[PDB]
């Protein structure tokens, strides 16, 4: 039975720890994969951590990591949440160096992009069997979310970008059913920059908060209806979401240029005019992580908010973070659970090692209360190398 | 179908071995988690061993174990009974440094506490999805059973403590249905100290034998109806069940203060006025274990009992122990099976290693006869370190 | 639905290879249990390999193996046929240093004996939960088949022995259902000696071909009905099946003393007055294996037989072997498929290592023709130790 | 419900990446089997990777590899597609130094041949249980596909060879039902040489394109109906498909002798008079790989073709490749989906190590577009040896 996306984000007051895989600590001795962007996505029955791997284990020569980001050895795989991703507990999903995945309530749709930078191609797989293909339309690094795609009413959607990671690039939103692109639209988003979008369903529409790697310290967003009729803008909140960024001053609804000329995959959840923002604690490094509730900051420009829930201390590394959803059909709830996962990145380039991998921690919505704390990766570097 | 807890504990003459995971021996080379409190719990179909990990494997630098007991890496996981807990074979359950779990006939209820000591939050999950949150109400290390909770008529129950592990603390009994607290009661138990409760259902009610870390050598207990109407007291037998403890002299039905101002998670099974006391063989160390049947001993003070069955020889190390039950819905029996597990602690503080982990063995009730013997951990220490 | 054991053994011409796990060779690097007696047994749906482990892995110090045969760490487990037994693919069955198992069409019956030599106890489990217990009745190493028991008409049967491994011992046949011993009989077998029986159903009855460790070079047998009314004897064939043994001279229908004073778990299939005998090739060691078809040989004394199918060369080590059965409920055949398995033992006492473990190979019945060959263990000893 | 093979090959334009296991890169630390000929075959629900192993893991002394190809330790196993084959994730299929496998829509049929060169025997299994045997009829290395067999309307087919791998050999086609040979036919192919056939169903008929190890640079083929009524020939195209082979000149419909006096296992898909040809890029080594579409090149001789899609750069190693198929009962499509896998051989004889193993990559049919690229093994040799 197809996942209805008609309900709304549940009302929350904080975030409860949902999972911590300790991959890198476990991986010191265990056969753990060296990985990146470990995003979570759920079905009507279970939740899985997807991730991309260079096809190498921690503490092996092959973790050498000097390799180009986009190698032909990169693969999308998944394992059950909270488990250290190893070759013994991971299901192969697709060959790719950028990807997303989501479940329509019936089957898994995975989207693995691979090939050369000037002709990369996205392979879509419904229940593991290739169902469609998408080719680079700009011949300049076709790439996608690196987190869950969103499904509604039997249709799933994703955002892909092709073009420079500096100036303008091209952005298309795709609508697919049973792994087949039935429709697609190129956003008319001049002066906007979209990368690694974190999308989620809400009352039959999709919202995505993304990364602006070109020229914005705040994050750009796009929300569209099942017919790909959209709207775009930037979280106006002066609690800037991107990293690097400037100190929290006065925000704006289009690209904040001071310091926002790079970035990190992140997310944000829109509540009315308010925003729950996840972000690194540091303004320079992918260190620390905190959730911030700025009621009415999605439209207003302030530096003030009302709640801050710590997640990872500034003294410990973080990295990519993205959002994921639990549908009522999995929960029994009468709303959609917003949840998020954080990538705790270790090694290069901030640490003196030959490799780079990450741990995940994830949290979920919830009305009852929570607490802030620090759930860092916890590995002692460097490794036997 | 919900688990009816209306039958009573099955009459028993002794305890037959049920399982032994050999985790620490296998861990010498295998990828086994370093763990603590591997309690067992069963559903209407199978039994699983739950345990807590620091997220490190045996024989690996990260099992350094100089970390605070309650680190943010401690996680609750489970694997089939008798298997070595490894990331290749364990299911992630929850992020926690204290917890319990129990199945109600439908799904697993897991309860994992994490967070700082001045406001730990218990996250309750039903079938893997968060269903409730309980906050510390004293802001002083909120903690729970470290063993199977008890379900009856579709409602599950547990006991949590908040406050000091020395003097008076606050104790509450929780009642939840489908992972949600539907009723809670604070016990009016001045002079009492409850910690790491071993609870079990009997005839529609729950009886818990716990640990008094404050000032008792005998174990305190609580029993309660499905409406949290309760009774409390201490095991009066002069066969003191805690550890440390004094030599078996004359008990009392309120905390025996000679020598019992510390302790160890243990259990006991009440039959009528008698008791099966599980406890260590030594009175100073967590070494050896034995089962003891002091009939007319739960209400009476003596030193005399009728049976003693050896489990682990004074010469070997033991540790936490807890009860678990096997319901007729799993068993086919017309009564509830009393079972228990014993944690075989190796390493620190009694050995000269840099870690602490434990193996597990369990036994079940039984009418037929058994044999006393010694099923110790069996690992050679130290390890390659 | 209960396995009907009413059909007869299928007629056969030779044995086709069924499996080979390579455990020891794989075990040089992989995490493989050091095991003994990996007998195979099947249900109505799958076949599984059971085996006993010392709770240790190949190439780790704990395989030190100087440990008594009967240690409290010994456990009964199982993994799918053909797979190397590791703590990552094996199910835990029971704590045991002697064992047997068999499926009745509904659930698995396992029997694991543990405890001291003067009072061992056999734990029976039906679907993993304890259903009965049997204590030593001579207080001298209660012990069992180390191979599949036999089920017919929803009752399973096994043979246990208690008493010395030299002179007269005591022999009992247990009839159990749903894992509960519903009847037992002590064989009245003066001058007989039964250990490690390999039993199989045929035409509603059970026949077991065992090992005489006391004074026989020929194998003793027992066959009984569902009411435990039995008959007994020795394979009369001069193609002596035990090991050690003399050169094939003239056999006798009661113990052949010469050279018959020790032995190895073996099996044999009776077909009318003929026997399919499996035995080692050497007469002083456990090396080589061959299936021999001596028609008119179970009741006659000859040295002559019609067929010999090599299985393991004399230049390679073998060990225990036993029979396991297919039933027409798992096969679709109108008869019972006789199969067998052979244990390839490497290490001590024949080899200069610190451990002993074995690999497994299996073959089945089959009407079509096969080929004799040699399927040895294939590991290079000694190991990294 | 049995798999109908009544539909035609789906029309296609190129090949989308389906999987990459990186087994070598991973085996560098992880416990992965050293394998050869990892063919893929699918059921109506999943696709698995079958491979053959020597019973040894990478980076362990048992991969020493000086061993005859045809050892008694060689086994057929399978694991999900895209996963690294390890004893922890692979299922045991059969003892075999040559094999094939296919699912008939109901259960899997595996064909494993083992035994000595003068009289090997193909053991057939249906759903894990032996269902027939086929003995060498020339006593000179009976051998089969090393790739998926073809199933149609409930009958599966395979091709085996017996005889010299130089001069005339003997070649037979077999039709089986429920793993039982129901009909076989010897090809009347004087001057032809068939080995390691890649077969596939098309419109209720099977087509196989094989290896001529005797005196052919082009590949020989056999197509047959459900009654084993057949036809034979060679791919006439001057786009020589074997390796070694000469530079692409003018070919012939009968064995091209220039340089095709050895070879490598391969495939091609027939569409009308056209042919999709999968082949290595070098004419001397098993290096690189590419798909070429030579329309009107299955019946014609040219050096001209229309499309060339790269799969592995000339600069990297490659190996066996085979066709597998996806049926409509699995895909939902209305036609049979052609796919292929490529074996990426590392080590001996081309590199300086003591072992030989292969990774795998695979691609499927597809109407949308794709891209040529290189997806090499990526392992750094030599290993710690
Ligand atoms: C014996 C003929 C056959 C083709 C030449 O040899 C194959 C060549 C191989 C090869 O050249 O890659 C390896 C195969 N595993 C082998 N199979 C057998 C049956 O031994």
mmCIF file of C-alpha atoms in Angstrom, chain B residues 244-352:
data_model
loop_
_atom_site.group_PDB
_atom_site.id
_atom_site.type_symbol
_atom_site.label_atom_id
_atom_site.label_comp_id
_atom_site.label_asym_id
_atom_site.label_seq_id
_atom_site.Cartn_x
_atom_site.Cartn_y
_atom_site.Cartn_z
ATOM 1 C CA UNK B 244 29.029 -7.202 49.228
ATOM 2 C CA UNK B 245 27.222 -8.687 52.259
ATOM 3 C CA UNK B 246 28.125 -10.217 55.625
ATOM 4 C CA UNK B 247 28.280 -13.956 56.360
ATOM 5 C CA UNK B 248 24.805 -15.496 56.535
ATOM 6 C CA UNK B 249 23.590 -14.762 60.120
ATOM 7 C CA UNK B 250 20.212 -13.323 61.025
ATOM 8 C CA UNK B 251 18.404 -11.279 58.474
ATOM 9 C CA UNK B 252 15.606 -8.773 58.799
ATOM 10 C CA UNK B 253 12.717 -7.459 56.746
ATOM 11 C CA UNK B 254 14.325 -3.978 56.523
ATOM 12 C CA UNK B 255 17.798 -3.140 55.159
ATOM 13 C CA UNK B 256 20.514 -5.143 56.840
ATOM 14 C CA UNK B 257 23.221 -2.519 57.147
ATOM 15 C CA UNK B 258 26.226 -4.772 57.975
ATOM 16 C CA UNK B 259 28.277 -4.684 54.966
ATOM 17 C CA UNK B 260 25.690 -3.988 52.406
ATOM 18 C CA UNK B 261 26.237 -0.447 51.564
ATOM 19 C CA UNK B 262 27.056 -1.048 47.945
ATOM 20 C CA UNK B 263 25.789 -3.978 45.841
ATOM 21 C CA UNK B 264 25.131 -5.843 42.613
ATOM 22 C CA UNK B 265 22.059 -6.277 40.305
ATOM 23 C CA UNK B 266 20.499 -9.598 41.341
ATOM 24 C CA UNK B 267 17.123 -11.343 41.355
ATOM 25 C CA UNK B 268 14.988 -13.630 43.426
ATOM 26 C CA UNK B 269 11.880 -15.688 42.755
ATOM 27 C CA UNK B 270 9.159 -15.764 45.351
ATOM 28 C CA UNK B 271 7.122 -18.865 45.802
ATOM 29 C CA UNK B 272 4.611 -18.556 48.615
ATOM 30 C CA UNK B 273 6.765 -17.760 51.608
ATOM 31 C CA UNK B 274 9.931 -19.288 50.085
ATOM 32 C CA UNK B 275 12.540 -17.758 47.837
ATOM 33 C CA UNK B 276 15.021 -18.815 45.149
ATOM 34 C CA UNK B 277 17.886 -16.565 45.888
ATOM 35 C CA UNK B 278 20.445 -16.172 43.159
ATOM 36 C CA UNK B 279 23.661 -14.714 44.409
ATOM 37 C CA UNK B 280 27.477 -14.712 44.300
ATOM 38 C CA UNK B 281 29.448 -17.283 46.210
ATOM 39 C CA UNK B 282 31.874 -14.768 47.692
ATOM 40 C CA UNK B 283 30.757 -12.057 50.216
ATOM 41 C CA UNK B 284 33.250 -9.411 49.067
ATOM 42 C CA UNK B 285 33.648 -10.050 45.371
ATOM 43 C CA UNK B 286 31.614 -10.612 42.322
ATOM 44 C CA UNK B 287 32.922 -14.178 42.178
ATOM 45 C CA UNK B 288 30.964 -17.446 41.842
ATOM 46 C CA UNK B 289 27.213 -17.714 41.703
ATOM 47 C CA UNK B 290 24.764 -20.103 43.298
ATOM 48 C CA UNK B 291 21.005 -20.636 43.507
ATOM 49 C CA UNK B 292 19.498 -21.154 46.890
ATOM 50 C CA UNK B 293 16.081 -22.320 47.914
ATOM 51 C CA UNK B 294 15.148 -21.082 51.378
ATOM 52 C CA UNK B 295 11.492 -22.108 51.738
ATOM 53 C CA UNK B 296 9.667 -20.005 54.310
ATOM 54 C CA UNK B 297 12.573 -17.483 53.900
ATOM 55 C CA UNK B 298 10.943 -14.447 52.140
ATOM 56 C CA UNK B 299 9.087 -13.576 55.288
ATOM 57 C CA UNK B 300 11.292 -15.321 57.857
ATOM 58 C CA UNK B 301 14.772 -14.615 59.192
ATOM 59 C CA UNK B 302 17.140 -17.659 59.347
ATOM 60 C CA UNK B 303 20.290 -18.850 57.756
ATOM 61 C CA UNK B 304 18.864 -22.217 56.963
ATOM 62 C CA UNK B 305 17.582 -23.251 53.533
ATOM 63 C CA UNK B 306 17.027 -26.596 51.812
ATOM 64 C CA UNK B 307 18.848 -26.498 48.543
ATOM 65 C CA UNK B 308 22.015 -24.944 47.012
ATOM 66 C CA UNK B 309 22.830 -25.402 43.339
ATOM 67 C CA UNK B 310 26.263 -24.226 42.101
ATOM 68 C CA UNK B 311 26.469 -22.162 38.954
ATOM 69 C CA UNK B 312 29.883 -20.541 39.021
ATOM 70 C CA UNK B 313 32.718 -21.630 41.343
ATOM 71 C CA UNK B 314 34.044 -19.203 43.957
ATOM 72 C CA UNK B 315 37.231 -19.392 41.967
ATOM 73 C CA UNK B 316 35.718 -17.581 38.945
ATOM 74 C CA UNK B 317 34.247 -14.211 38.275
ATOM 75 C CA UNK B 318 30.564 -13.438 38.156
ATOM 76 C CA UNK B 319 28.542 -10.107 38.167
ATOM 77 C CA UNK B 320 25.062 -8.696 37.412
ATOM 78 C CA UNK B 321 22.347 -11.359 37.314
ATOM 79 C CA UNK B 322 18.577 -10.876 36.387
ATOM 80 C CA UNK B 323 15.422 -12.809 35.884
ATOM 81 C CA UNK B 324 13.618 -13.268 32.625
ATOM 82 C CA UNK B 325 10.508 -15.204 32.031
ATOM 83 C CA UNK B 326 9.095 -17.441 29.413
ATOM 84 C CA UNK B 327 5.394 -16.993 28.937
ATOM 85 C CA UNK B 328 3.081 -19.873 28.111
ATOM 86 C CA UNK B 329 2.329 -18.162 24.817
ATOM 87 C CA UNK B 330 5.938 -18.955 23.874
ATOM 88 C CA UNK B 331 6.196 -22.180 25.807
ATOM 89 C CA UNK B 332 2.899 -24.036 25.490
ATOM 90 C CA UNK B 333 3.047 -24.468 29.262
ATOM 91 C CA UNK B 334 0.192 -23.451 31.577
ATOM 92 C CA UNK B 335 2.471 -21.326 33.752
ATOM 93 C CA UNK B 336 5.285 -18.808 33.601
ATOM 94 C CA UNK B 337 8.847 -20.011 33.359
ATOM 95 C CA UNK B 338 11.231 -18.425 35.703
ATOM 96 C CA UNK B 339 14.774 -18.037 34.152
ATOM 97 C CA UNK B 340 17.883 -15.999 34.993
ATOM 98 C CA UNK B 341 21.091 -14.854 33.428
ATOM 99 C CA UNK B 342 24.388 -14.198 34.969
ATOM 100 C CA UNK B 343 26.961 -11.807 33.690
ATOM 101 C CA UNK B 344 30.541 -13.167 33.908
ATOM 102 C CA UNK B 345 32.653 -10.025 34.334
ATOM 103 C CA UNK B 346 36.285 -10.061 33.159
ATOM 104 C CA UNK B 347 38.974 -7.462 33.382
ATOM 105 C CA UNK B 348 38.841 -4.319 35.433
ATOM 106 C CA UNK B 349 38.789 -3.627 38.344
ATOM 107 C CA UNK B 350 39.742 -7.101 39.623
ATOM 108 C CA UNK B 351 42.127 -7.967 36.748
ATOM 109 C CA UNK B 352 45.054 -6.310 35.269
#
